[PDB]
Design a protein around this ligand. Structure first.
Ligand SMILES: [Zn+2]
Ligand SMILES: [Zn+2]
Ligand SMILES: [Zn+2]
Ligand SMILES: [Zn+2]
Lengths: 73, 77
DNA sequence: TCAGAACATGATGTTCTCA
DNA sequence: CTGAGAACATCATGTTCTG
């Protein structure tokens, strides 16, 4: 489906998996970024176009479960 | 030290009744901010999200419910 | 075809008015 | 010594523009 991460309209395979424009950046900034993403549920959040801004911990955990690589070095 | 009573909404050390109940400076502006502008938030979970000082940004759909449950209101005239 | 500058914003806290 | 509302100054995600 479009964005095997947020179900929004994907722009094309990004970092290895089909994603929207947003998802691209999120996963770039998440990875190269000092963070402490903490979920406020049970690590099972729904993630769509709208519901995505909500939980970063799960969304990133999604930009990890479904391939999405930065690739070594 | 520095524990001046937890926000009835989130948990952060609040500061004086705001819009009806003990809330932080954060929650104060949120509840004023959540009512005026168009919002219609969407909870990304099972409508029971923790709203402590950290995760309070995560789900404003629940924090609002928390405000509406702590009886927050603009009072009126 | 896809990267990431880069320009959009958006959302949020913490002051600092004031009465 | 209140308890509100600017308006700051801060982040966080989204869009277009660039190779
Ligand atoms: Zn996406
Ligand atoms: Zn989550
Ligand atoms: Zn609070
Ligand atoms: Zn929620």
């Amino acid at each position: 489906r479009p964005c095997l991460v947020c179900s929004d309209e994907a722009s094309g395979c990004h970092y290895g998996v089909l994603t929207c424009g947003s998802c691209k950046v999120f996963f770039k900034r998440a990875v190269e970024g000092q963070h402490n993403y903490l979920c406020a549920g049970r690590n099972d959040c729904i993630i769509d176009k709208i519901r995505r801004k909500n939980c970063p911990a799960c969304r990133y955990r999604k930009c990890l479960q479904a391939g999405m690589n930065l690739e070594a070095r």
